[PDB]
């Protein structure tokens, strides 16, 4: 069949993948239209209600579906605006780490030699310290903010995509079709971007979905530690910054931000193995 419809016919076998894609779609629609769908403004402090339970719990109120935080702010409206910032940072982290990482991986894998040694020793130095710890070192030097966290995450996600692109390119460059085009007269820009790139594209489409998973986990972690976004911002990580005090007083405040994160990341991992199943025989 045609490559797009053959991909969908195989992807639809993995039901879990379809579930995940559904979820993804749903949260993207919530992220776009939050200003119309969400009950109240993310910053509005109520004071006639303060740490009040969910709508179904006794002493709760049906005006605040997922209850209220300790300074009087609705949890449901805050989770939906958290979705905007979490998916937007996922987009910048995955898009820039793909663009810069695939280019460096093709430049390293095809040209080889000195260029490969310089690129791979720099990537190996960049991976000599754990992902989150290197991002924390960068953010503490430049200052806690959503932009500085997104930039730090793009810079730390880059080496993974370089190493993965190179590994795919070295499996292609030894194959006879790359040699046949070299005999036919093709220049390096053609060989990389017109011949090798569409053949190594299969793993990168998987690693884009698995990249959204790590982008929103590490951004939530950054947020939790107070480095990723500042306390007024409605971000799922920030919402858990200081909540362990509420384990007895208010279970909803601790539960829902992290359940949302889990759901989101699980959905993207579901798509990741759905794409993997659709991209091999």
């Amino acid at each position: 069949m045609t490559p797009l419809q053959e991909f969908w016919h195989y992807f639809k076998r993995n039901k879990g993948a379809v579930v995940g894609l559904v979820y993804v779609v749903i949260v993207l629609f919530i992220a776009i239209f939050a200003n119309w769908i969400a009950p109240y403004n993310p910053a509005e402090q109520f004071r006639d209600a303060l740490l009040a339970p969910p709508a179904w719990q006794e002493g709760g109120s049906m005006a605040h579906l997922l209850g209220t935080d300790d300074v009087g702010r609705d949890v449901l409206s805050r989770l939906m605006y958290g979705a905007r910032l979490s998916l937007l940072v996922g987009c910048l982290v995955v898009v820039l780490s793909l663009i810069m990482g695939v280019i460096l991986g093709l430049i390293a894998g095809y040209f080889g030699g000195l260029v490969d040694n310089i690129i791979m020793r720099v990537v190996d130095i960049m991976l000599a310290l754990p992902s989150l710890l290197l991002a924390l070192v960068l953010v503490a030097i430049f200052g806690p903010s959503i932009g500085n966290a997104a930039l730090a995450l793009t810079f730390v996600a880059l080496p993974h995509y370089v190493r993965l692109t190179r590994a795919a390119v070295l499996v292609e460059v030894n194959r006879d079709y790359v040699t046949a085009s070299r005999v036919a007269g093709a220049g390096a820009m053609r060989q990389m971007f017109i011949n090798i790139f569409p053949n190594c594209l299969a793993p990168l489409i998987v690693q884009a979905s698995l990249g959204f998973s790590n982008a929103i986990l590490d951004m939530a972690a950054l947020g939790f530690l107070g480095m990723g976004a500042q306390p007024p911002t409605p971000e799922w990580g920030t919402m858990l910054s200081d909540v362990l005090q509420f384990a007895q007083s208010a279970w909803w405040v601790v539960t829902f931000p992290g359940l949302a994160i889990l759901l989101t990341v699980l959905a993207f991992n579901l798509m990741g193995d759905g794409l993997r199943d659709a991209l091999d025989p």
């Binding site: 020793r121 310290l129 754990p130 972690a221 939790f224 530690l225 107070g226 539960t255 992290g258 889990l262």
Partner: protein
């Protein structure tokens, strides 16, 4: 083997000189021979003074390294002892309810916010079911006599010199930290064990193993699992490197004495000397762990062992 391990050393040394130069750039900017003087400082143990304690970064690092290593070996002993059997079993039983449950739970663990997972277990199994202690490496009831040659490892010290019940405290405080930290390692090990086992169960040497008339047990345990453990050995190395990201998150909620809590407190207080010296001490230990794992891969793998 020598002509393999000497090439791993050949890639390690340029990486190590890299971390010494980048950490030099950081301690200089917050006479090129000032790098020779700084690495003389590092090699003589003259890492800086932490600005809040006014104690050398090395004197602070040692105790916390120990406290992190207990939690690390418990997370890995849990993740390897539970994970490999579940991964083998799932691949042996492909398409069973077991196989779907194992794949679903491994996706669920690999997708999980580790700090939140800890708060859920603290809330469930220390607050609402009163089964485990809420925080710390050991309770205030434990007071070990300093006169004894203490190791600094709380499990060992409380087993050998503790009063009645003190080892039971030392383990009861450690099970939640280990289960929470070990969840991502366990999820990676179950996944990589399945995929590695299922590619091996497709190979022609297992058709030969069945054609010889072997029991299914020998085919899985002897023929399949040795070939399947080569990539498992590999990813266990990547996990014991990346585990300190889980340490920063878990040690914070559990108020554990540890390198994760000392580094993130230093970052939040802008105590640059602790993060400047602690980045070098973390990065050098990642290099040593990778170097040992590669040596382990060299002895296990006979393609690497015997070639030269």
């Amino acid at each position: 083997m020598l002509q393999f391990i000497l090439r791993r050393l050949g890639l390690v040394i340029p990486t190590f000189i890299g971390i010494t130069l980048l950490t030099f750039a950081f301690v200089h900017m917050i006479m090129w021979q000032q790098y020779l003087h700084y690495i003389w400082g590092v090699m003589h143990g003259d890492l800086g003074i932490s600005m809040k304690s006014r104690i050398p970064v090395w004197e602070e690092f040692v105790p916390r390294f120990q406290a992190t290593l207990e939690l690390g070996v418990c997370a890995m002993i849990f993740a390897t002892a539970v994970g490999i059997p579940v991964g083998v079993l799932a691949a042996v039983k492909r398409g069973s309810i077991f196989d779907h449950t194992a794949v679903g739970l491994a996706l669920t663990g690999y997708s999980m916010p580790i700090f939140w997972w800890g708060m859920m277990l603290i809330m469930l199994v220390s607050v609402h079911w009163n089964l485990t202690p809420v925080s710390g490496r050991v309770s205030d009831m434990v007071f070990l006599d300093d006169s004894n040659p203490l190791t600094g490892f709380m499990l060992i010290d409380t087993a050998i010199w503790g009063e009645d019940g003190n080892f039971i405290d030392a383990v009861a405080h450690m099970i939640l930290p280990a289960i929470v930290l070990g969840t991502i390692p366990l999820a990676v090990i179950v996944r990589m064990t399945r995929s590695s086992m299922l590619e091996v169960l497709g190979e022609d040497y297992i058709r030969t193993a069945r054609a010889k008339g072997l029991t299914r047990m020998r085919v899985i345990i002897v023929h399949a699992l040795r070939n399947a453990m080569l990539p498992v050995v590999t990813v266990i190395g990547l996990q014991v490197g990346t585990l300190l990201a889980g340490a920063i998150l878990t040690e914070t909620i559990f108020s554990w004495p540890g390198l994760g809590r000392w580094l993130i407190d230093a970052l939040q207080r802008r105590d640059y000397p602790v993060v400047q010296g602690g980045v070098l001490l973390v990065a050098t230990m990642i290099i040593l762990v990778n170097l040992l794992v590669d040596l382990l891969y060299g002895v296990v793998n006979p393609r690497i062992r015997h070639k030269k």
